[model samples]
Target: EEYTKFPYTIEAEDCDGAGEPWTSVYDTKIKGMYSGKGFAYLTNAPISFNVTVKEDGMYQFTAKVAQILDKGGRLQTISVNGIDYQYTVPYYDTWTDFDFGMHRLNKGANKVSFKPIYGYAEFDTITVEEATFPDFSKVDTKLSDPKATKEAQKLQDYLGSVYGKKIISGQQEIYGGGNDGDYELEFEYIKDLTGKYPAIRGFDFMNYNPLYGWDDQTTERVIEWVKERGGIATASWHINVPKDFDSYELGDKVDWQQCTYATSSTFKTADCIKKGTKENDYWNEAIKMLAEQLQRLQDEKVPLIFRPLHEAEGNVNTDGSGAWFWWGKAGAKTYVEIWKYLYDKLTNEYDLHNLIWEQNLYAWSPDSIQWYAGDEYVDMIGYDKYNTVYNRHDGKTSGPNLDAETPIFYTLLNFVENKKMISLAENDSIPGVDNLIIEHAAWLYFCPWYGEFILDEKNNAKSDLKEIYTSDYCITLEDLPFSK
Candidate 1:
């Protein structure tokens, strides 16, 4: 409740760069407005101010601003002492509050800056309130999973207990090359370098490789290999309908719109699992086909952390004619319906209990909340990001941006009731140990996308990768429960 408020006004002597004041700004409602006016304009450049703190502790920062009505919602990126934070602003006729979370500030003058990436906006005030965050070390509660198998339960137990303690290291190219179905020549390069492999091995079931039959037998072999090494396995499916393949039609490759634009094609949303229609019958057959491979894993008693129907937020066309994936174009209602339907068929109908369903995070989807089927249906929350370049001066690209992932991680922490574990399902680069420690972003696991992501020297990431693999904070293959 203890806080300090700094009002934005022309006479406040805080306007710098493109920041300026406007008169009679729509009957301002913010407290402590100077002469009923506010610092009403900001450009793409940073508008800065100096705040002197009397004490050293965590403080929650808040900004009051009005979004430009003509430009719709604007994304404003703010920073404190050089560290950036992002907040999305919606069109508001009056000043609205935007909380930027807690920050540990020293008892001295601190520089804070704001820049709107989307468009211009009005700035009213910036307030800093003394605050305290929850103890992440303490497990607040254990989420229930009544339908889980023993293996899945064991994995969940590990995840629940280890939520904030340490982040597990994982890699997708554990047993595969950069291209298609071949294993990497240096699958054990990390192990050879640091005497430890990753705790988790990632695999993909593309379901069609022409030469390798429908099962992707090489990936199956890698699965067995991972189990033999006492490591865990997680799989993702880029399921493509056989009927949509370009080879079958010969020079007639269908665009994404053609596949999902209509209601009754083999790849269309209405036909591909919208329950109760005759079209759903064919969709059910496709679902069963993918389930056949999952059933085999269940038969082998291999628990899988499965991520399916990912990146539904992307679209191939500008008019929203088609989504990035076959299962995504039908909007949230149909998307949720299909996801729930698949969950039901796999767990209840097919009895494949040796699996943990993970919902992938889509940064662009405004309707992502509608895509969630519920906590009962999902055991974990994960995100996949690529080409996250922080400092590129040395020709190296870093992983998830702290400014972006920090808010996102904490948001998910609260959204999932601080119970379900969160992870970086797929990434191009890994964050440094110190970065994770400073941000308090204890991502449960991070699996870098295979190929040039890890092996490319142009990435300038060999040293960073080694640091992550060797850091005491990261749990490698040797740290697993089953590791000898």
Candidate 2:
């Protein structure tokens, strides 16, 4: 009983190279393990295993993985001849079998290297067998709300059309504080450099919060871009509350510097649904302010790829900390209810359905999946990347950081179960075209953040943008095939 039948097995503990082998002598008794032996806490590169095949042909790869972590899925990658494949190591009581799709094996003694990306999973064994997966070509174009407008439907269809075929270029606008004429500064800059504008424009409903009680001109500008210029629009909500919400009163306007969306805000997310709670009142006020502009966009027939309450979980996996936003401060349980509540409120009460709803995902961890509002409430999923300037990959120094972000992209695809398109909703630098095409990442679009991300030469080279913006695979404003 060295291995499982119906296939060949390579025990991880028996594998060569940098990882240590282990037996049933560990803390947890791993039952149902193929040979009751595996590798524990394998955290180095090139954990090599050799397999013999009859001839050169394609074979399927599956890894029997067990992660004992309480939350947050980790990644363990398998490399064949320097080409990498990933497995999302899940948290489960029993060992789970994960398929890496298919790979080509040589005639004999093919060495597969297992390296830790997150590197936090225990491996029992790997089984190579026949391949299989469903065809994901057919898309779910049906919106959550049947009363969704044709504009919204068409925009989703257009989004589906370009998905995987081309990457749409997007630019976000600043709050446009008295820079009304120059609100299109980023757009103008892009136009001048490449003689083309981004296919999508992003606006944030930051200042429209009850605290400000003033228009940031975001909705009007989005209307202009779609109605006047024939471009697409997306938006986010940065509704703010005073950092000291405990000492606050309704209708008390506070200085902008005193308020933020950070988790440090004294607001309570869990209290948002409780009746007679100030948290509920404040949450309602925030949503009411957001709804005003949403209704305007609905009236104007502007379809927005709306990403409200974005980046809800930041470093929850790595640091065991909470989210970057106040909405996620109360943890996933409260966050999920907040999302569903907001969805029902907007889709039913407000009667606004001109939105192609997208939820922002981070780190591709299973723990973050708890925060997902589910497929019925969402139309698309997005992953935000600021890893370059933050230097998450290449130490603490910034560079081109052109990784196609395949690991994140594929993980999101799998996370959503391929039912939705994965978008690079926010980015610091556009991944190089070579990485994008070569890695088969095929992200739906790329929206670089405002300010230095797009305007400064230090973050993204003018040549890089022009090159990426001009690529045949990139869909620019002029290349837009769908209309408002």
Candidate 3:
């Protein structure tokens, strides 16, 4: 067998453990298999290869893969010489390349395997070739809002300056958690552990809506964090709508519990765009309440990394049905309208210029692009990473999720011809320092969701925190150039 050659292709059907209850062969079932005869159906088992190589060096690894599920993508695993690498394989009915990036191969026979992490995708041949990695340094520095304040420009420029080079550290104060959640809970804890604060503090405007009006002092805190401390601010709007937004009217006042952001509500998002509709009217007030805070921040010369209508495709399937938020319930078309509507209201009507707009989008299905508000409106891309307990790459019941998730980063990069800076907008367990460096995940930042996601020792090791926060690859509060 000529396995000792450049650009070697290992037929997955012929690899070890490709048969039995989990897999079967069929070229006719799929339109594009590697050799057109057959491909291994990766249903439940492992498919792998043992190829002898002449040199011990890094090789570019890729697999011919396909997924029929409308799930946007499948979390898949590949192993080389006892080391494991996991990343998402995107949704495509026909064959496409899932680049495994680059992996090291030793002289002589090497053990490489591909297994189902989330499962239910087809596997053809695993291709590896002697090669070097290509340049991934594509990021735009300019904010889309032309009227963007100097502070906004400087903040975005700073973020872009470190885009593929270093990851800025971040942490979210719990949603509607309380006033000073960052000081008392999130940032305080991280500073205690690592002797440094996350450069970016994530905040939620959940309570600032007219119906809620709890105030929680979020606006004041955001101002203080940025103006006083010279830290960066990124706020998300988890603004609520009445569960029965259908029945609610102009004068309706909803109980806090009755107004849910969850997908279970009957509230329709399409109404937000239709001029005369009540959703539009209520949404108008929502934006009104939102702009009030931005005005205060702008007045104080504090710029924000704003993310609204985020996670639009939460746990959704094809046709955009299973959205987990009121803003996304009406699916992609309606969601996009709400996003653009908000952008116009905030940028044009409200005349808010101290904002650097960012969005959270999941590439779960081919139709995911429908959620984007377009390149003209957005400045950055973000993925909120929350992997299920059963899918951690370490195969442990609990620990930090160390997968750099390069696939999602690369996939999101392909969305725009003029690439935008992508970040781990929000995440459960922060990716390990080693993986982020080695795999080149290069997200702008990783702001772990408050509480257990960060404070839990099970989710992140203290030693890991000290290493990441203090390491040169990460930027902490003290490292910022223009802090007050």
Q: Per-candidate TM vs. native?
A: 0.74, 0.79, 0.79
lDDT of 1 by residue, 1-484 (tens): 2234533222222556644466434564434443334454665666776666676545677766666544457777777775666667777656667776876565677777676565466676666666556565575323334667787778777776777778898877533333454554335666766567888878776543221224447447545655677777787866554344333332244343333322233555635575565446545655676677777777777778888777554533222244566676677667767788888888888888878888865534344556566777787888775545632222334433322255557766666666667788887667667667655676889887676666664431666767878888888887787643
Two-way TM-score contest, 1 vs 3, winner: 3
Q: Which stretches of candidate 2 lie over 4 Å from their true place?
A: 1-77, 80-112, 115-136, 178-181, 317-320, 389-391, 394-396, 482-484
Q: Please give the lDDT score at residue 311 for candidate 1.
A: 59
Per-residue alpha-carbon lDDT of model 3 for 1-484, expressed as tens digits?
Answer: 3557777887667778776322333433545545544677776777788767775666788888777764577788887877776777777777787888676667688888777676678877778887564344545677898889999999988887787789999998876654444445767889888999999999888787867577688888898888788889999988888888667887567888888877776665777778887878988988898899889999999899999988887765534577877788777777777788888999899999999889887766546777888888899888998763744555666566676776677667777543678899988878888778766667889998887888887777788889999999999999898858
List residue ranges in candidate 3 displaced over 4 A. 1-58, 62-109, 113-138, 176-183, 388-391
Looking at candidate 2, what is the lDDT of residue 227? 87
> How far off is model 2, as Cα RMSD?
6.3
Q: Candidate 2 clash total?
A: 0
Best by lDDT: 3
Q: How far is candidate 3 from the true structure (C-alpha RMSD, Å)?
A: 5.9
At residue 20, give the lDDT of candidate 2: 60
